[PDB]
Design a binder for this molecule. Sequence first.
Ligand SMILES: CNc1nc(NC2CCN(Cc3ccc4c(cc(C#N)n4C[C@H](C)N4CCN(S(C)(=O)=O)CC4)c3C)CC2)c2cc(CC(F)(F)F)sc2n1
Length: 467
Amino acid sequence: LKAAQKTLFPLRSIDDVVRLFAAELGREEPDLVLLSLVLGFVEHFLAVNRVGLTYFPVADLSIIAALYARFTAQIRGAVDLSLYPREGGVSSRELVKKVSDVIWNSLSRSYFKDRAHIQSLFSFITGTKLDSSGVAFAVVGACQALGLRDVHLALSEDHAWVVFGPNGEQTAEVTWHGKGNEDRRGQTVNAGVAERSWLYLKGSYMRCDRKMEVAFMVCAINPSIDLHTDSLELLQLQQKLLWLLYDLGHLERYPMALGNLADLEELEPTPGRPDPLTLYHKGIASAKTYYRDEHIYPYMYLAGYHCRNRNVREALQAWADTATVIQDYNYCREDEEIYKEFFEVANDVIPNLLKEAASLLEAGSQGSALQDPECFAHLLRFYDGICKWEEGSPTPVLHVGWATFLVQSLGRFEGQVRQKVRIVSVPPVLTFQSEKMKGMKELLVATKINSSAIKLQLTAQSQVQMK
Ligand SMILES: CNc1nc(NC2CCN(Cc3ccc4c(cc(C#N)n4C[C@H](C)N4CCN(S(C)(=O)=O)CC4)c3C)CC2)c2cc(CC(F)(F)F)sc2n1
């Protein structure tokens, strides 16, 4: 560490950690290794082991500098730069692979790879454990420590890798995804881009600078103590650090970070700040501006907020927007995480919401989503996008389990409401993009819902029971 990096120690409070991040973010290049070690230290003593806690776990320079020295020694010792000449101030694929191998080979042979609190360089050093995206971050921090200014973190909505090389144009896989089913470690991401999978976002993934890599580690803070309890101290630290990054402009290209900040503000609003809704909409605006509106989670963040607040109209609208994004992807083998999200929304969340709305309608609610044809249109647009998604995909999406819930959900709206939606062809008003929903149009607006016909149309089940 440089002398100027050490003057704020010891860190005795949340605000002292914020000052450290402010100082680093004002430097030429913030020190990723220093910052991740500090966050992991304070997370360990606020969420993993709170024995002896009286206010805040004091981070002494001697402790942090020793951890820092362990990391930099491990990397500099195992990676000999002389073997990998750098032509052009840029790194080679072999060098990036070597750094990835060094991180990988340091990890415990067996552990639960989905645990909490294994995201930081603190976990790497003290526990020899990292989660999937934690390995990618560690590769980037190791590269920074080695002076490899061109190596940066790349992020989709469910995976992480690195960019590097001439113009920062090369990609390399450096960690596992999911079960570790495939690998492609060391290869480009271009096959996944070319297949139009959600996992690689059609190439509209995040290419971090150093400041966005700091935002990533802040988003990566895990306040959870257990399944029922969060650390207030860590929630506050994450919130204050996210506001710092926001004010400095470093969340401009980070949609999900804005959703995280909005969620924190909902829990505990900061005087004189934008409201959660404004922040969710900035997240969506970031995705439209920088990522061709090809991201799903900005709309999911918004929908969840509306769901929690029982704004059924606005929740349905946001979900219909999630589907309007997914429809221009192919559903591929490693996209299971976003299938799980759509599944739970269609087959659990929406049914719960509409069941409650039905009871409230019985009790005399006015302005009910169930009496609003625009709400029925949103529901139909949601299913349309899912059906369009499935078109031309190498693996199907829909099955009869989905059909039971679609029929139930349609039935929550009376015929007099459903009949008000106008479904218009290309070449409330809605246009369907999917052939499935186009074929379902007359069934949707009929006084009595034909369940079996709907099932057949949604699943493209050819035949009905013989006997
Ligand atoms: C913040 N930075 C960041 N975050 C990353 N990933 C985040 C993606 C969002 N999740 C939280 C999450 C999960 C599911 C969500 C939602 C929202 C919805 C909806 N509807 N849904 C659907 C589900 C079914 N329900 C709906 C009902 N609600 S409720 C009870 O509240 O009403 C709960 C959630 C959210 C917000 C947290 C993690 C990532 C990932 C990266 C790639 C890599 F590899 F690094 F991991 S970078 C990154 N950055």
